[model samples]
Target: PQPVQLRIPSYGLLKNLTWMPQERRKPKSTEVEVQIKAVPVNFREVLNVLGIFQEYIKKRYRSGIISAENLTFGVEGVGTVVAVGSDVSQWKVGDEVILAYPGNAFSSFVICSPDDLLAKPSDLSMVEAATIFMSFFTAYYGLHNLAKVQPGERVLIHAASGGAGQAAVQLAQFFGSEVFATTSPHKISVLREQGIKHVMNSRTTEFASEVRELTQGNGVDVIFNSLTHGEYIPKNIDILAPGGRYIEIGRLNIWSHEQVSQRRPDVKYFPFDMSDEFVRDKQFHAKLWDDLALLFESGSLKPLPYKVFPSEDVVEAFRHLQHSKHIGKIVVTMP
Candidate 1:
């Protein structure tokens, strides 16, 4: 067994320290070791930092699928395999790959199960691929899986210039859906460049009415909302065509302020009821693993724009992420 030395940022400033475990641990039967190259900062990653993600962690908190104390630091990344366990044949030493969620991927080295690895597109840059797993996957799943967006369907995406929002716009366009999205005044041009047909300014203008008017009051087939603001969800429901689905990926506002603010546990649920003991002909969905893999292979998805910091600056990267001004993903690179 051999130990490896890596650098990780300390709590303050740009300083870092050598992180060397005493013993090298080999991969488990279903696991492999990857030398992580880049790991993007996801919106969920930001929430995790704020202690909000604690509830979403598995057993530890009531809200999480896993416990908060059981949670790891990172979710996805691009890395190269350095070792493999006996049962793993999908990859070997020297393979470049993208990782799916569930493992902490921000470190210099990672131990991941076979299920987590996906082949990186040969043409994409490391930085670009680093942004793919979270945002693009979310967009891909929300539009295709949850909304089941069909060609010619009208789709609306909130925060269209943000990472997930940008991916949703592009993915919807690729799927042949008519796409409308909302952004601030500053990001309208950027959204235009990404091929969103209609751009609404959520701050200055009302989006639901604009969407309805744009579609001649038929409303949209699907609404992909990342904003957790109080009014947006109901407005999304109002603007949705009957039987339409609303897929929520991220929220600008915390969950506690919503109409169902008193809701218990962190698990997802819809507030409205359907006629026969069902929720409104509307469906709300979140992103998960199998969905992420499907779109990565479908060619309809790609990574978001990002800034990649060396692992030595992970804390600084977190600080930058906390402020919430940057566009797209922020990542950490390891040797």
Candidate 2:
């Protein structure tokens, strides 16, 4: 079946996309027609562009999930549904939504599952709603679901100037934790504007020791770790308090176990295996979106800052994001 779909045939570093008109295809079982409104360029999407996220995509694809390829410019967007199939009773035409699960989100419109579409909040514009879901949901899921962070817990969030990092910092504070965030000297003020109580300068100071002293050597109960730089892993481990949770959402290094073992034999992994109750008692959180809609409706949650570029200037959007000068999200608005 042919549909007017935007196809990405391989993965590479390029911003040019082809618009090919093809035959329209009918929706499959449990699928609906969605007219995409907007998609935000997430940092993970940037990593995928660099080919660092292939393993993460492949692992999910092995479980019957769709994986991104070089030819396609992957997106995370909000859209309006124009049709639905027989089994799709929950969605209908004109419903505004975002891709909840992974597939090609960079298109004018596409057929998708209910799992990939969510009701756009009445309070948010299409662009604002599009920007909030991925990062904020990740932050909330990491703190509440993974670590079970509670009031009075001391928490440290790394890369606090980036999209997810900033979200985690604010969410930790909202959840009643004493929040500390790490960023370069230039971005410290950004964190402070968000009401973050403490800022750690990653380039000038050691975060682990500062956090330890700030908490009076008791250590922090949680660390929202996003930097996958291998060296920080051991340092973060050193600063974790007893029963502390280290929730990792990003990794700079992507090696298979054998590859990692061969390349970095000196590297040390966390001591607890998954089956160990003592380790399970402390948890690790990866990003997910189980309760995003509810949280957004709660009014306490806010969308991250975004610089929306017109669809034509896609390359410039990515260039700015790559330079790391943008304060929040960088989104591309489709025509």
Candidate 3:
């Protein structure tokens, strides 16, 4: 077995880190192992580094505190298959691919089930593919699967210029919805270029009022909310039309029963967790990847803009993401 060297957290803090084991277990009969080429820095990775998900991490590692020994952290990456198990018929060795599920993605190598792997599109570089799965899948499931957005219906995306927000904006437009988005004042022009005609500056403008005025007081049919602020919850509920759907992808606000019942009892609330869905059904995960690939191929959906960093600068990448300074995805490429 070849030795593998990879980075791991040295402590719970964002800046601390270290390396990995001399050897890892070989792929199982149903697995496809890959040499990871690039990985994206996600908001979840930042949460783990800052100890926001510390309890979950502790439970995962069966430890009292997070340390180098149990600190492999990443979910999505683009890689090239180095080995495939006997049971894995869909992919063979040397295929470039993306891993969409939980794995040690920051490592030099990863072993994922055949179901978790998607063939990388030929036109996209490894860095670009690295940014796709998480954000796009989350957006896809929320809008297409849960919300079931129809052509000519109204859809509003909160934080419309962020990673997942950008995906939601494009997917909503692709579904033929009249897309409205709330973003920072500076990003309004960028959203407009993407064909989102109703863009609100969330910083200086009251988005709920904007949505009401844009829809002529009927309210929107679907709201894809990625904003963390709790105050936005009731306001989002207020903007939802009768029988409207609210798809929430953020963890910042926990709406109590009292809040939801009082705000808009007729409105439907969908709290989406892509990982939960992935675990619940394997075929569903594969199908989403397939659908997203077709959209990418046809130019209906596009990869988010990204800033790439060498793997050694992974810590700096996390810092940049933590500060929320970047507009799109932050990706790390292996040396």
Candidate 4:
């Protein structure tokens, strides 16, 4: 069967997104062909579709990181290796795997090199495996490498109901840190059900003051923040304890490290850019992803909640994500 894929007819509007047939190419000596099973939607993809990353996309295009045929759509996905190249010995047909950074994962099929493949945790379903990449990768880097949360330390996570945010809460708890989380008014109970006692509203900055009082005026040791744009930035910085780490994954209305340092010179601020990390040191991230598979296999890292739509309903999925109607993650599947 010929492969079909999502098409970006025009930028700036979700209605412009649709799908069409794509030419199927045979794998090269170093490549494998993946029949995509599931793909998870992230804000990055939505913004990419909206023309927000036009220049960034152009840079990637110029650099040869992004291909003309392959759009910067889904960051990763779960799939089966249905075909392999003549000289490719590492993988064979029927091997189930995760496409770690195949940019065109929204497609029904993806042709990729070994560099983009990761062994799927034996226990995870396709949807569960697809749900982990963008969320867990960011959470893993910020919580462990940058913030280095220790047992008994407190971590405040903004938008804690999102895919990455939910993953952060789970990872922080895994790190033995006390987790203080915030989200839209409706999803507060989800955090509580996950056993977080320090749940607050993400809509207002008042959570900053509330967390200070809850921590007995000590404030949090680390903050995994995606909100805190513009005027709200200081309220977040105000609650960060001395020497604490402030990790920013949000793109818009963000603060420069200089701006953050000017206010709280004692705290460490990082504008965490996952895309840049991949372009800069894919080797390091590749290694981390390999190690992370163990956590899922051992049940230390659990999959976040997700809603799935068939490939035909991809636009609906995108709209659901855009409207913030679902909690955790939104996944699109291909049969």
Candidate models: Cα lDDT each: 0.64, 0.66, 0.79, 0.83
What TM-score would you give candidate 3 relative to the actual structure?
0.89
lDDT of 1 by residue, 1-335 (tens): 23333323322222233334434568998899888788876666555545564333342121344543334456667988999998998899999988766345755677767766777777777888888766766676567655677999888888876777777777888789988878887878877776666888966338888888888887887777767666776666677775676676554453333442333222232322111111111122122444554555565566676777886676677776666556677877775
Which candidate comes out best when scored by lDDT?
4
Estimate the lDDT of model 2: 0.66
Candidate 4 residue-wise lDDT, 232-251, digit = tens: 68998999887888998887
Better of 2 and 3 by lDDT: 3
**Residue 212 miss distance in model 1 (angstroms):** 2.8
The TM-score values for the models, in the order shown, are: 0.75, 0.80, 0.89, 0.94
Task: Judge candidate 3 against the unseen true structure and give its global Cα lDDT, from 0 to 1.
Answer: 0.79
lDDT score of residue 331 within candidate 2: 77
Q: Which lDDT value does model 4 have at 114?
A: 74
Tell me how far the alpha carbon of residue 116 in candidate 2 is from the true structure, in angstroms, after superposition.
2.8
- Distance from true position, residue 67, model 4, in Å? 11
* Off by more than 4 A, model 4: 55-70
Candidate 1 residue 243 C-alpha distance from true site, Å:
2.9
